[PDB]
Design a protein around this motif. Structure first.
Motif, short mmCIF file in Angstrom:
data_model
loop_
_atom_site.label_atom_id
_atom_site.label_comp_id
_atom_site.label_asym_id
_atom_site.label_seq_id
_atom_site.Cartn_x
_atom_site.Cartn_y
_atom_site.Cartn_z
N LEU A 6 3.42 -1.59 4.28
CA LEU A 6 3.09 -0.17 4.33
C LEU A 6 4.32 0.59 4.79
O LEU A 6 4.58 0.73 5.99
N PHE A 7 5.09 1.06 3.81
CA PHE A 7 6.40 1.66 4.07
C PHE A 7 6.36 3.17 3.96
O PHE A 7 5.96 3.73 2.93
N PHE A 8 6.77 3.82 5.05
CA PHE A 8 6.79 5.28 5.16
C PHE A 8 5.46 5.93 4.77
O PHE A 8 5.42 6.86 3.97
N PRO A 9 4.36 5.45 5.39
CA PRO A 9 3.08 6.09 5.09
C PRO A 9 3.13 7.55 5.56
O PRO A 9 3.91 7.88 6.46
N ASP A 10 2.31 8.40 4.94
CA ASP A 10 2.32 9.84 5.22
C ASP A 10 2.36 10.06 6.73
O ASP A 10 1.47 9.62 7.43
N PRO A 11 3.43 10.70 7.23
CA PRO A 11 3.61 10.78 8.69
C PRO A 11 2.75 11.81 9.42
O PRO A 11 2.54 11.66 10.63
N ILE A 56 -0.82 -0.74 -4.61
CA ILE A 56 -1.85 0.30 -4.72
C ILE A 56 -1.25 1.65 -4.37
O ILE A 56 -0.62 1.79 -3.33
N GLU A 57 -1.45 2.65 -5.23
CA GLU A 57 -0.88 3.98 -5.02
C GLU A 57 -1.76 5.02 -5.69
O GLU A 57 -2.00 4.92 -6.90
N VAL A 58 -2.23 6.00 -4.91
CA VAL A 58 -3.10 7.07 -5.43
C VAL A 58 -2.36 8.09 -6.29
O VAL A 58 -2.98 8.82 -7.08
N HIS A 59 -1.04 8.15 -6.12
CA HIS A 59 -0.20 9.11 -6.82
C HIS A 59 0.13 8.55 -8.21
O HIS A 59 0.97 7.65 -8.34
N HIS A 92 -5.76 3.97 -6.95
CA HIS A 92 -7.02 4.13 -6.24
C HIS A 92 -6.75 4.11 -4.75
O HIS A 92 -5.70 3.63 -4.31
N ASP A 93 -7.68 4.66 -3.97
CA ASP A 93 -7.61 4.62 -2.51
C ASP A 93 -7.56 3.17 -2.03
O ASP A 93 -8.49 2.40 -2.27
N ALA A 94 -6.48 2.81 -1.35
CA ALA A 94 -6.29 1.42 -0.91
C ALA A 94 -7.37 0.93 0.05
O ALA A 94 -7.70 -0.25 0.05
N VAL A 95 -7.92 1.83 0.86
CA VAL A 95 -8.97 1.45 1.80
C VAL A 95 -10.17 0.89 1.04
O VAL A 95 -10.68 -0.18 1.39
N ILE A 143 0.83 -1.19 0.00
CA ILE A 143 0.00 0.00 0.00
C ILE A 143 0.87 1.25 0.00
O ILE A 143 1.79 1.38 0.82
N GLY A 144 0.58 2.17 -0.92
CA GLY A 144 1.33 3.43 -1.02
C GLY A 144 2.76 3.22 -1.42
O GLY A 144 3.69 3.70 -0.75
N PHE A 145 2.95 2.51 -2.53
CA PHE A 145 4.28 2.09 -2.96
C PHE A 145 5.17 3.21 -3.52
O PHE A 145 6.35 2.98 -3.79
N1 LIG Z 1 -5.25 5.64 0.84
C1 LIG Z 1 -4.15 5.48 0.10
N2 LIG Z 1 -4.15 4.55 -0.91
C2 LIG Z 1 -3.04 4.36 -1.70
N3 LIG Z 1 -1.90 5.11 -1.48
C3 LIG Z 1 -1.88 6.04 -0.48
C4 LIG Z 1 -3.00 6.25 0.32
N4 LIG Z 1 -2.68 7.23 1.20
C5 LIG Z 1 -1.41 7.64 0.98
N5 LIG Z 1 -0.92 6.92 -0.08
C6 LIG Z 1 0.43 7.00 -0.65
O1 LIG Z 1 1.35 6.55 0.32
C7 LIG Z 1 2.63 7.01 -0.08
C8 LIG Z 1 3.45 7.33 1.17
S1 LIG Z 1 5.06 8.08 0.79
C9 LIG Z 1 6.02 6.54 0.80
C10 LIG Z 1 6.16 5.95 -0.60
C11 LIG Z 1 7.01 4.69 -0.70
N6 LIG Z 1 6.45 3.58 0.13
C12 LIG Z 1 8.43 5.01 -0.24
O2 LIG Z 1 8.86 4.56 0.83
O3 LIG Z 1 9.14 5.74 -0.94
C13 LIG Z 1 2.41 8.22 -0.99
O4 LIG Z 1 2.91 7.95 -2.28
C14 LIG Z 1 0.89 8.40 -1.00
O5 LIG Z 1 0.32 8.81 -2.23
#
Ligand SMILES: Nc1ncnc2c1ncn2[C@@H]1O[C@H](CSCC[C@H](N)C(=O)O)[C@@H](O)[C@H]1O
Length: 200
Positions: A105-110, A58-61, A85-88, A35-37
């Motif tokens: 789930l690596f380094f999710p938005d802090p 899965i990645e929204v960006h 798409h939104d992973a949830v 999630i959020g790759f």
């Molecule tokens: N609900 C969601 N579904 C999918 N991606 C999500 C999300 N909420 C946040 N993200 C994504 O989570 C990522 C966290 S930044 C970390 C990115 C990567 N894992 C790395 O370590 O470099 C962002 O790219 C953001 O767009």
């Protein structure tokens, strides 16, 4: 050009239908979800090293999705699929219960600011949702470089029946082979790994 070129090959559209992994991947094999790759470097490295396993990201960006596709194509991977798409929502609507070997789930938005604390993805309902999608013995592995988030993650995960902490010290684990070192990488990164076990 990566999105236009490789989305038709490795992309998966959002729908309200449960995914058939054998149909998606063309075989029966363990599935790992990230999630959020981001740019997908970890996911591509993972898939490249484990051709016998299958991987969903899965990645929204969307630029991240594009970068991941470009890299996956560059490595000639057949065992990787991605969603934008939104992973949830994907978890709720598309991932079958008890189906996943691992969720990363690596380094999710802090969300450093207290005012934003609820925006952090690791919360009890989300963690419960992830749990429902892991096979027994499957693992939820998260990592962060922000200690307040690490502590919050630990509190959330420790509160949930059916998650067993793999930490020998009942908190954090050493970085496993399944997560790459960061460019700048205690040593300022916290890994948490919990295994799904039967409800007590
Ligand atoms: N609900 C969601 N579904 C999918 N991606 C999500 C999300 N909420 C946040 N993200 C994504 O989570 C990522 C966290 S930044 C970390 C990115 C990567 N894992 C790395 O370590 O470099 C962002 O790219 C953001 O767009």
């Amino acid at each position: 050009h990566a999105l236009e070129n490789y989305w038709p090959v490795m992309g998966v559209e959002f729908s309200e239908d449960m995914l058939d992994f054998p149909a998606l991947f063309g075989r029966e094999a363990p599935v790992t979800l990230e999630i959020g790759f981001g740019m997908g470097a970890s996911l591509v490295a993972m898939a490249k090293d484990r051709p016998e396993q299958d991987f969903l990201g899965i990645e929204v960006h969307s630029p991240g999705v594009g970068a991941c596709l470009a890299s996956a194509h560059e490595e000639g991977l057949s065992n990787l699929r991605v969603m934008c798409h939104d992973a949830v929502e994907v978890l709720h609507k598309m991932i079958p219960d008890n189906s996943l070997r691992m969720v990363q789930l690596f380094f999710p938005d802090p969300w450093h600011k207290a005012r934003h604390n609820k925006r952090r993805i690791v919360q009890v309902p989300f963690a419960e949702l992830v749990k429902s999608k892991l096979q027994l013995g499957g693992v939820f592995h998260m990592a962060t470089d922000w200690e307040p988030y690490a502590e919050h993650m630990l509190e959330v995960m420790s509160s949930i029946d059916g998650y067993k902490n793999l930490s020998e010290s009942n908190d954090y684990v050493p970085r496993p082979a399944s997560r790459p070192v960061t460019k700048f990488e205690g040593h300022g990164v916290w890994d948490l790994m919990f295994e799904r076990v039967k409800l007590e």
